[PDB]
Amino acid sequence: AKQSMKAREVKRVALADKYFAKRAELKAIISDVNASDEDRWNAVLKLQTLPRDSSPSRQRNRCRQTGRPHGFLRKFGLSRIKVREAAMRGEIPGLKKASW
Template sequence: MKKGVRCWLRLIFHFGIEDQDVAKLSMINREVRRARVVAQYAAKRTALKEVIQDLNHSDEQRREAQRQLQALPRDASPSRLKNRCRLTGRPRGFYRKFGLGRNKLREAAMRGDIPGLRKASW
């Protein structure tokens, strides 16, 4: 089995995606890769940021830390991560508390899969 096919099968298994198009799978795959890069560089980024913000270091040390921080990959920044629905991979209408998009959250709530959540009625 080819490597790309294996990767997609892993994504389908991980996210529960069955009928998604290739474009959406590639975006989900990109987000997974970004999360891996963010985790890989997290310690280095925090160490460099501490040096930059610490006024006890010399200006030259702080400038060098700034250069090193800028030399890191763009995807190493946590702000580049996008929350996605665990079931569909949809990037918009995401509820952080549940990890689901609005459509799948509504379906799960109507089925009673989420304890304590019910449709509003007044």
């Protein structure tokens, strides 16, 4: 919930998909079975300048409103104790409680 944490997710997501996350021709095409030329280093040369703010592997992939690393689920965008309070309040399309 920390201001700095919730802004730290923002400062990462504003640029990750704005940068090498899509600017990825130097990601996989360079890293192949091609010549053992400078390419093997040229891969790391760009990444040494690149921040670890921008990499698909980096971000926690959590909720947005909370700022909490846990409770988030991939399909929703919200943490557990908020998404359930909206769920059984009704604000999830077609989501209800059944049994077997």
